[PDB]
Write a protein that binds this ligand. Sequence first.
Ligand SMILES: NC(=O)[C@H]1CCCN(C(=O)Cc2ncncc2Cl)C1
Ligand SMILES: [Zn+2]
Length: 139
Amino acid sequence: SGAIYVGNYRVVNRHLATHNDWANLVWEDSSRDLLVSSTTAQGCDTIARCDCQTGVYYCSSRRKHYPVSFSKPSLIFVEASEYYPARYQSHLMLAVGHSEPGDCGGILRCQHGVVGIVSTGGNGLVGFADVRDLLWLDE
Ligand SMILES: NC(=O)[C@H]1CCCN(C(=O)Cc2ncncc2Cl)C1
Ligand SMILES: [Zn+2]
């Protein structure tokens, strides 16, 4: 679990969005596993606007942060789960690092701000949904 709170927006994994997120929907994209909802309170986070390929992510299944080198956002095949059929997920970045079911929502940050959230993983890989291209989150 986990979310990004920026301005009057809450960014979550689309597959973990609540009834309240869907009732206050701003934007969602199944191909990216993202959903953004509106908030009444002002958010605590700031978004990176950069091309960093290294950073640090929070891994809830270890209660720890780990440094990672990750690929540029791209279209990656993701196997079927209870949440989605087998499909290509877009704007996904992969890295070597621990992740297991329940780690989705952990933030990846570089020195410039929030880069994205955990969205996939397994067998010593961790995948992050990029948010750096969503320029409207800042306005
Ligand atoms: N973005 C998706 O399609 C994910 C929806 C939830 C399921 N999913 C996963 O990868 C779960 C997973 N399994 C093993 N290690 C880590 C993780 Cl996060 C795929
Ligand atoms: Zn950066």
